[PDB]
Amino acid sequence: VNSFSGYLKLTDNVYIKNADIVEEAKKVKPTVVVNAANVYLKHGGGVAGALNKATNNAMQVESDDYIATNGPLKVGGSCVLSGHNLAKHCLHVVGPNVNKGEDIQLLKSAYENFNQHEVLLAPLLSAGIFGADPIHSLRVCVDTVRTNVYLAVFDKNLYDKLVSSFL
Ligand SMILES: Cc1nc(C(=O)N[C@@H](CC(=O)O)c2ccccc2)c2cc[nH]c2n1
C-alpha cells in the first residue's frame, strides 16, 4: 500500500492520472520523482522547468555542480539527485528530443532507468516539448517498466485520449 490516490490502473504495475506532477509530488512526497531532463540538466521549460521552479532553483544549482563534475548525461541515460522539497530523490532521465533529431528507439533505454527503483512518480518520457507521440511513449513505458510507476499527465484532453486509446 502506498499514498498515490485517484490513479487509473492500466496494467499490473502501470498507473495513470490527469495531474500536475509538481502538485502531486508536493502532496505525496514520493521516494522518487522522475524529471524529463536533458543531457546538460538545464531545467528551462516543460516538466524540468516546472519541477525546478518549485524547488526555488535549488534543483538547477545542484544540477550545475553535477555537470561541472561529471559532464553531460547520455540520451537514454539518467542520474539520481536530490528531490529537494518535492521527493526524497529526483531521477533525471533523458528521453530523446524529437525536435533535436534524436533516435526514438532510445525511448526504451530511457524507460529502463525506471527499473532501478521500486516505485516512481513520472511523466511520459519524450512527451510535451520533447516532441514524441505520447501514445507511443505510454506504450513503451508499459512494455519496458516492470517496477510500479505512477504517471501524472498534465493535460486533461491528452489523458482522456491516452486512456480511451490504451490497448
Ligand atoms: C505531468 C506534467 N507534464 C508536464 C508537461 O510538460 N506535459 C506534456 C505532456 C502531458 O500532457 O503530460 C504536455 C504536452 C502538451 C501540453 C501540456 C503538457 C508538465 C509541465 C509542468 N508540470 C507538468 N506535469
Swiss-Prot record:
Record entry for activity regulation: Inhibited in vitro by GRL-0617.
Protein's membrane topology: Multi-pass membrane protein
Reactions accelerated catalytically: Thiol-dependent hydrolysis of ester, thioester, amide, peptide and isopeptide bonds formed by the C-terminal Gly of ubiquitin (a 76-residue protein attached to proteins as an intracellular targeting signal)
Macro domain residues: 1-167
Cellular localisation: Host endoplasmic reticulum membrane
Function: Responsible for the cleavages located at the N-terminus of the replicase polyprotein. Participates together with nsp4 in the assembly of virally-induced cytoplasmic double-membrane vesicles necessary for viral replication. Antagonizes innate immune induction of type I interferon by blocking the phosphorylation, dimerization and subsequent nuclear translocation of host IRF3. Also prevents host NF-kappa-B signaling. In addition, PL-PRO possesses a deubiquitinating/deISGylating activity and processes both 'Lys-48'- and 'Lys-63'-linked polyubiquitin chains from cellular substrates.
Subunit structure: May form homohexamers. Interacts with N protein.
Name the UniProt record assigns to this protein: Papain-like protease nsp3
